[PDB]
Amino acid sequence: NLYFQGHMYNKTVSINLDSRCNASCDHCCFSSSPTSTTRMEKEYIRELVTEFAKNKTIQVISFTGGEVFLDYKFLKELMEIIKPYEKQITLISNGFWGLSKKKVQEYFHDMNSLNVIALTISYDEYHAPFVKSSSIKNILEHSRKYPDIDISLNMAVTKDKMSNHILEELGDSILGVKITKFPMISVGAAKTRIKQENIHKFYSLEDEDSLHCPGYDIVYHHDGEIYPCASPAIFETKITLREEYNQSFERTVEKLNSNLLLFILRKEGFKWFLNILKENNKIEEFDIPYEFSSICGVCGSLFNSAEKINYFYPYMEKYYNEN
Amino acid sequence: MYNKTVSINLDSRCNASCDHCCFSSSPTSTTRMEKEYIRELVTEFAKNKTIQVISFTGGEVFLDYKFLKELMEIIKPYEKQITLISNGFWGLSKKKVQEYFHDMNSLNVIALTISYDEYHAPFVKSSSIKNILEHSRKYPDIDISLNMAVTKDKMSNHILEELGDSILGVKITKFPMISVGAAKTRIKQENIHKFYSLEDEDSLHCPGYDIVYHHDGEIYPCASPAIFETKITLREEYNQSFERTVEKLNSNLLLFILRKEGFKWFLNILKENNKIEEFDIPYEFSSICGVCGSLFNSAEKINYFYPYMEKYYNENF
Numbered sequence: 001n002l003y004f005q006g007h008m009y010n011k012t013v014s015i016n017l018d019s020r021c022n023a024s025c026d027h028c029c030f031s032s033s034p035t036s037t038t039r040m041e042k043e044y045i046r047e048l049v050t051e052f053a054k055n056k057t058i059q060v061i062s063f064t065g066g067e068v069f070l071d072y073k074f075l076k077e078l079m080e081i082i083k084p085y086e087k088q089i090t091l092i093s094n095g096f097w098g099l100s101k102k103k104v105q106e107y108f109h110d111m112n113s114l115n116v117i118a119l120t121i122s123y124d125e126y127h128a129p130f131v132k133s134s135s136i137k138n139i140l141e142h143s144r145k146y147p148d149i150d151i152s153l154n155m156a157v158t159k160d161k162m163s164n165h166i167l168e169e170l171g172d173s174i175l176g177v178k179i180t181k182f183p184m185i186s187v188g189a190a191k192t193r194i195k196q197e198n199i200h201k202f203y204s205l206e207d208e209d210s211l212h213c214p215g216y217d218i219v220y221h222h223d224g225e226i227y228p229c230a231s232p233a234i235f236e237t238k239i240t241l242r243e244e245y246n247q248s249f250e251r252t253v254e255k256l257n258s259n260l261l262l263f264i265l266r267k268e269g270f271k272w273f274l275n276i277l278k279e280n281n282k283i284e285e286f287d288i289p290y291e292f293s294s295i296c297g298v299c300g301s302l303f304n305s306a307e308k309i310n311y312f313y314p315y316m317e318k319y320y321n322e323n
Numbered sequence: 324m325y326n327k328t329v330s331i332n333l334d335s336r337c338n339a340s341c342d343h344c345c346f347s348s349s350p351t352s353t354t355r356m357e358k359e360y361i362r363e364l365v366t367e368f369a370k371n372k373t374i375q376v377i378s379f380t381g382g383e384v385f386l387d388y389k390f391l392k393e394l395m396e397i398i399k400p401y402e403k404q405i406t407l408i409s410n411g412f413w414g415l416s417k418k419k420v421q422e423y424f425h426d427m428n429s430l431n432v433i434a435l436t437i438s439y440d441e442y443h444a445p446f447v448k449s450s451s452i453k454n455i456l457e458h459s460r461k462y463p464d465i466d467i468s469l470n471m472a473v474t475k476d477k478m479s480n481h482i483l484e485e486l487g488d489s490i491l492g493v494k495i496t497k498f499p500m501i502s503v504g505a506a507k508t509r510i511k512q513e514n515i516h517k518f519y520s521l522e523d524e525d526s527l528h529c530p531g532y533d534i535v536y537h538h539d540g541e542i543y544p545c546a547s548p549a550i551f552e553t554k555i556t557l558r559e560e561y562n563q564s565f566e567r568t569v570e571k572l573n574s575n576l577l578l579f580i581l582r583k584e585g586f587k588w589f590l591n592i593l594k595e596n597n598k599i600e601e602f603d604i605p606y607e608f609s610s611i612c613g614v615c616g617s618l619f620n621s622a623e624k625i626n627y628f629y630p631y632m633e634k635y636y637n638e639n640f
């Protein structure tokens with residue numbers, strides 16, 4: 001009462017628990033593998049989760065990696081910290097644990113009792129050498145006993161690997177499951193292990209009309225930085241929200257809401273930045289591609305270096321003085 | 324409760340004649356409410372202070388696009404959100420796709436569901452679906468879904484491959500058949516997936532009520548294909564207000580018992596009285612809506628539960 005909308009982006013948060021994974025996908029934006037060492041400390045993650053659970057605005061806490069079910073003991077401990085505070089939880093997994101019917105029974109029982117409202121399973125031709133089809137089927141079939149857990153199947157595809165046979169092999173286990181096939185973002189292992197010809201190109205620089213950011217969503221990443229979104233493309237940029245080791249979530253939200261570059265991006269769209277480079281003939285100097293698989297790819301190539309961000313500084317400063 | 328969303332089924336007429344159609348829709352379908360009556364309904368829903376979302380279904384709502392746009396423009400000054408479902412026949416022309424997306428975006432259409440599968444395929448070509456899906460990328464505020472109705476013999480595997488990269492970023496859901504309408508007589512029951520049985524207690528719960536003003540002139544408590552073959556209606560008179568429809572839904576004893584006790588309350592009565600075979604309750608079913616449809620698809624069946632529901636009312640409340 002007597003207050004209008006304050007800060008945005010404070011209802012959800014994501015934590016990337018670790019870069020370690022059982023799989024070594026050739027497209028992995030983080031080049032994840034069993035030998036990946038990039039991660040925040042366990043006690044630091046416990047403090048973060050405790051703070052997010054006690055926070056009055058956060059409604060949803062999401063966990064990602066890496067493979068979050070790889071160290072299940074630690075994942076269940078984090079979920080039990082949240083439990084007395086009744087926050088909703090979302091999980092994403094490669095479903096390696098589907099190989100064991102005992103783990104399938106136990107994990108669904110735990111997710112249901114720990115307020116896990118959504119589980120996304122990632123399966124495609126890039127994941128297929130590391131996880132069997134029957135493991136995915138066991139998870140999808142058992143999810144029918146837990147209708148309150150929203151189940152999704154995310155498939156990362158290329159022109160040569162469209163996952164048509166993968167989806168057929170899953171049989172009727174996909175009935176009622178939301179399936180989304182998405183193109184690659186040229187970051188991490190996809191940059192060097194996938195032919196760029198095989199990456200779908202849906203956007204071009206000439207269609208600035210439809211180039212707007214899908215929306216911010218705070219991520220506390222395994223590199224110890226904080227990002228304004230969960231897109232694979234953002235982790236390659238110099239856009240971070242961390243100023244110190246012990247930063248509060250209220251401070252992260254305040255920084256996101258006062259960041260001038262991100263305010264201009266949300267309000268004016270990508271055309272504001274692209275027209276500044278076109279007007280000053282800098283598209284070739286900054287090696288900005290002409291075609292992209294996603295709007296995030298444009299974002300990635302506009303701010304993936306300090307030279308590029310610093311270039312926009314006088315224009316953003318001029319925008320601030322005018323408005 | 325249940326007063327934030329409402330659906331209107333505009334007509335049973337369709338350009339398609341799908342073999343699974345829950346309404347047996349076709350170009351020669353004559354069941355519909357009058358246009359002026361629909362205008363009055365839409366005006367009342369637009370002026371209503373609680374309704375946030377108005378959905379349109381059929382039949383094929385884009386078949387008479389002039390009337391659909393007219394209804395959307397009645398809603399426009401009141402700023403309600405709109406959802407649409409279509410077979411995408413209009414996708415044949417990219418210029419027509421550009422026009423309809425421009426209108427949907429300016430008329431607060433927040434979601435568009437496209438239905439395409441092997442049952443829809445003889446009536447709509449693949450390229451028409453692709454044109455709609457590709458152009459939807461320019462309108463990220465419109466939530467795009469592809470819904471595919473499948474059977475064991477028609478799983479839509481080749482249909483999805485033929486769509487190529489037009490499905491990238493689109494939520495796809497394959498769902499089984501409900502044995503109603505044309506699916507009852509044109510599809511072999513062995514081809515209908517059976518996921519649940521009378522013994523799976525965690526599945527015997529209604530997914531939730533959602534008010535539908537249907538093309539038969541009745542009002543239903545949900546949008547499931549199964550409810551339209553039941554005698555569960557919320558209409559008591561021709562000129563009934565939405566406040567009254569909501570009041571009737573919230574005071575309906577059968578629907579209160581169903582939501583609170585689940586389907587096991589009704590099924591145990593029939594098992595205890597040896598009426599499972601008399602009522603033709605299926606042992607196995609593709610979804611819980613299949614049980615709902617078989618419990619309540621006749622006045623005799625509904626009236627059978629009355630003394631038990633009356634006893635429940637006296638014991639509780």
Ligand SMILES: C[S@@+](CC[C@H](N)C(=O)[O-])C[C@H]1O[C@@H](n2cnc3c(N)ncnc32)[C@H](O)[C@@H]1O
Binds near residue numbers: 021094122154188190
């Ligand atoms: C990095 S994984 C982490 C969680 C878990 N290991 C999994 O695969 O679901 C998150 C999602 O991003 C997708 N992904 C990975 N690298 C990507 C890339 N270069 N471009 C687009 N999506 C990518 C994965 O396929 C997966 O669906």
Ligand SMILES: C[S@@+](CC[C@H](N)C(=O)[O-])C[C@H]1O[C@@H](n2cnc3c(N)ncnc32)[C@H](O)[C@@H]1O
Binds near residue numbers: 345346381383503506
């Ligand atoms: C009756 S249609 C009306 C809207 C539009 N003509 C369309 O096909 O999307 C609504 C949805 O119900 C589905 N449907 C029709 N008959 C069905 C049945 N017997 N069982 C399950 N779904 C059915 C259709 O495939 C479609 O996705």
Ligand code: SF4
Binds near residue numbers: 021024025032066
């Ligand atoms: S995409 Fe997921 S499963 Fe594959 S390597 Fe990366 S983190 Fe592991």
Ligand code: SF4
Binds near residue numbers: 215216228
């Ligand atoms: S456009 Fe940029 S900021 Fe927005 S979601 Fe994509 S990568 Fe993140």
Ligand code: SF4
Binds near residue numbers: 338339347348382
């Ligand atoms: S399922 Fe939709 S397109 Fe097919 S006949 Fe029925 S109303 Fe028409």
Ligand code: SF4
Binds near residue numbers: 528531546612
């Ligand atoms: S269970 Fe019955 S009332 Fe509930 S959605 Fe299905 S048909 Fe409608």
